[PDB]
Amino acid sequence: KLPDDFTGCVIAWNTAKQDAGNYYYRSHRKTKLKPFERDLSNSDENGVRTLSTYDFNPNVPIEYQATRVVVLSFELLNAPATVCGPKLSTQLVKNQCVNFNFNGLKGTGVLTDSSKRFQSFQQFGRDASDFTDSVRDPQTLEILDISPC
Protein backbone atom coordinates (compact mmCIF):
# COMPACT_ATOMS: atom_id res chain seq x y z
CA LYS A 1 0.00 0.00 0.00
CA LEU A 2 1.22 3.49 -0.90
CA PRO A 3 0.21 6.42 1.34
CA ASP A 4 -2.06 9.17 0.07
CA ASP A 5 0.74 11.66 0.86
CA PHE A 6 3.17 9.68 -1.30
CA THR A 7 5.96 11.53 -3.06
CA GLY A 8 8.14 9.37 -5.20
CA CYS A 9 8.11 7.53 -8.50
CA VAL A 10 6.74 4.11 -9.44
CA ILE A 11 8.85 2.29 -12.03
CA ALA A 12 8.09 -1.04 -13.68
CA TRP A 13 9.23 -3.17 -16.61
CA ASN A 14 8.42 -6.62 -17.97
CA THR A 15 10.88 -9.38 -17.01
CA ALA A 16 8.98 -12.51 -18.10
CA LYS A 17 12.20 -13.90 -19.60
CA GLN A 18 14.19 -13.38 -16.37
CA ASP A 19 11.74 -13.98 -13.51
CA ALA A 20 10.33 -17.40 -14.29
CA GLY A 21 9.48 -19.49 -11.24
CA ASN A 22 7.05 -19.31 -8.34
CA TYR A 23 6.25 -16.05 -6.57
CA TYR A 24 3.58 -15.37 -4.01
CA TYR A 25 0.93 -12.81 -3.16
CA ARG A 26 -1.58 -12.54 -0.33
CA SER A 27 -5.06 -12.99 -1.81
CA HIS A 28 -6.96 -12.51 1.46
CA ARG A 29 -6.46 -10.74 4.76
CA LYS A 30 -8.80 -9.84 7.61
CA THR A 31 -7.80 -6.17 7.26
CA LYS A 32 -6.09 -4.10 4.60
CA LEU A 33 -2.42 -3.24 5.00
CA LYS A 34 -1.42 0.16 6.28
CA PRO A 35 0.81 2.19 3.93
CA PHE A 36 4.27 0.57 3.65
CA GLU A 37 3.16 -2.18 6.03
CA ARG A 38 4.43 -5.70 5.32
CA ASP A 39 2.97 -9.08 6.33
CA LEU A 40 5.33 -12.06 6.00
CA SER A 41 2.98 -14.64 7.62
CA ASN A 42 2.84 -17.83 5.51
CA SER A 43 0.72 -20.36 7.44
CA ASP A 44 -2.57 -19.69 9.19
CA GLU A 45 -3.38 -20.89 12.72
CA ASN A 46 -4.00 -24.43 11.43
CA GLY A 47 -0.98 -24.66 9.13
CA VAL A 48 -2.31 -24.27 5.60
CA ARG A 49 -0.68 -21.45 3.67
CA THR A 50 -2.41 -18.08 3.32
CA LEU A 51 -0.38 -17.13 0.21
CA SER A 52 -1.41 -17.58 -3.42
CA THR A 53 1.14 -18.34 -6.14
CA TYR A 54 1.97 -16.56 -9.34
CA ASP A 55 2.93 -19.05 -12.01
CA PHE A 56 5.27 -16.96 -14.17
CA ASN A 57 6.40 -18.30 -17.55
CA PRO A 58 7.18 -16.49 -20.80
CA ASN A 59 4.29 -18.62 -22.14
CA VAL A 60 1.59 -16.94 -19.99
CA PRO A 61 -0.55 -14.14 -21.49
CA ILE A 62 0.93 -10.65 -21.29
CA GLU A 63 -1.39 -9.54 -18.48
CA TYR A 64 -0.07 -12.43 -16.35
CA GLN A 65 3.59 -11.91 -17.27
CA ALA A 66 6.02 -10.81 -14.56
CA THR A 67 6.97 -7.16 -14.16
CA ARG A 68 9.59 -5.89 -11.78
CA VAL A 69 8.50 -2.81 -9.82
CA VAL A 70 10.77 -0.31 -8.08
CA VAL A 71 9.08 2.32 -5.92
CA LEU A 72 11.29 5.28 -5.03
CA SER A 73 10.10 7.38 -2.09
CA PHE A 74 11.58 10.86 -1.73
CA GLU A 75 11.97 13.64 0.79
CA LEU A 76 12.94 17.27 0.24
CA LEU A 77 13.45 18.44 3.81
CA ASN A 78 15.47 21.36 5.18
CA ALA A 79 18.31 18.88 5.67
CA PRO A 80 21.52 17.91 3.87
CA ALA A 81 21.15 16.58 0.35
CA THR A 82 21.74 12.83 0.13
CA VAL A 83 21.09 12.09 -3.56
CA CYS A 84 21.49 14.61 -6.37
CA GLY A 85 21.10 14.98 -10.09
CA PRO A 86 24.25 15.29 -12.21
CA LYS A 87 24.37 19.12 -12.34
CA LEU A 88 27.79 20.76 -12.45
CA SER A 89 28.42 23.58 -9.99
CA THR A 90 29.28 27.15 -11.04
CA GLN A 91 31.13 29.88 -9.19
CA LEU A 92 29.24 32.21 -6.89
CA VAL A 93 28.20 35.63 -8.18
CA LYS A 94 27.49 37.88 -5.19
CA ASN A 95 26.01 41.39 -5.13
CA GLN A 96 24.28 40.89 -8.50
CA CYS A 97 20.74 39.88 -9.35
CA VAL A 98 21.10 36.30 -10.59
CA ASN A 99 19.24 33.09 -10.99
CA PHE A 100 20.50 30.50 -8.53
CA ASN A 101 20.06 26.80 -7.82
CA PHE A 102 21.29 25.48 -4.46
CA ASN A 103 20.69 21.74 -3.97
CA GLY A 104 17.85 22.01 -6.46
CA LEU A 105 16.28 24.95 -4.63
CA LYS A 106 15.97 27.27 -7.64
CA GLY A 107 15.23 30.97 -7.33
CA THR A 108 16.37 34.46 -8.19
CA GLY A 109 17.70 37.28 -6.07
CA VAL A 110 20.90 38.91 -4.85
CA LEU A 111 23.47 36.78 -3.01
CA THR A 112 25.65 38.15 -0.20
CA ASP A 113 27.55 36.84 2.79
CA SER A 114 25.46 36.71 5.94
CA SER A 115 25.72 36.85 9.73
CA LYS A 116 23.13 34.07 10.05
CA ARG A 117 23.77 31.24 12.47
CA PHE A 118 22.30 28.12 10.89
CA GLN A 119 21.73 24.82 12.63
CA SER A 120 24.20 22.09 11.76
CA PHE A 121 21.68 20.38 9.45
CA GLN A 122 19.91 23.47 8.15
CA GLN A 123 20.17 24.21 4.43
CA PHE A 124 17.99 27.30 3.98
CA GLY A 125 16.26 29.94 6.05
CA ARG A 126 12.88 31.59 5.62
CA ASP A 127 11.31 34.66 7.19
CA ALA A 128 7.70 34.91 8.41
CA SER A 129 6.52 35.25 4.79
CA ASP A 130 8.31 32.01 3.80
CA PHE A 131 10.56 34.22 1.69
CA THR A 132 13.79 32.23 1.58
CA ASP A 133 16.22 34.82 2.94
CA SER A 134 19.29 32.60 3.38
CA VAL A 135 20.83 29.41 2.02
CA ARG A 136 23.82 27.28 2.99
CA ASP A 137 26.28 27.08 0.13
CA PRO A 138 26.77 23.29 -0.28
CA GLN A 139 30.32 23.79 -1.59
CA THR A 140 31.76 26.02 1.15
CA LEU A 141 29.06 25.53 3.85
CA GLU A 142 29.02 29.32 4.25
CA ILE A 143 25.62 30.98 4.69
CA LEU A 144 24.51 33.40 1.98
CA ASP A 145 21.78 35.97 2.33
CA ILE A 146 19.22 36.17 -0.48
CA SER A 147 17.73 39.59 -1.16
CA PRO A 148 14.97 40.51 -3.62
CA CYS A 149 16.24 41.66 -6.99
Ligand X SMILES: *[C@@H]1O[C@H](CO)[C@@H](O[C@@H]2O[C@H](CO)[C@@H](O)[C@H](O)[C@H]2NC(C)=O)[C@H](O)[C@H]1NC(C)=O
Distance CA 7, CA 5 (A): 7
DSSP of 111-143? EEE------TT--EEE-TT--EEEEE-TTT-PE
Do residues 107 and 99 lie in contact, with contact meaning Cβ atoms separated by under 8 Å?
yes
5 binds, among ligand NAG, other proteins, ligand X, none (CB under 5 to 8 A by kind): other proteins
Give least dist CB 18 to other proteins, A: 23
Do residues 123 and 117 lie in contact, with contact meaning Cβ atoms separated by under 8 Å?
no
Using rule CB under 8 A, residue 131 touches other proteins: no
Using rule CB under 8 A, residue 80 touches other proteins: no
Binding-site string for other proteins from residue 18 to residue 57, where x marks contact by CB under 8 A and - marks none: ----------------xxxxxxxx----------------
Binding residues for other proteins, rule: CB under 8 A, are 3, 5, 34-41, 75, 77-79, 119, 122, 125, 128
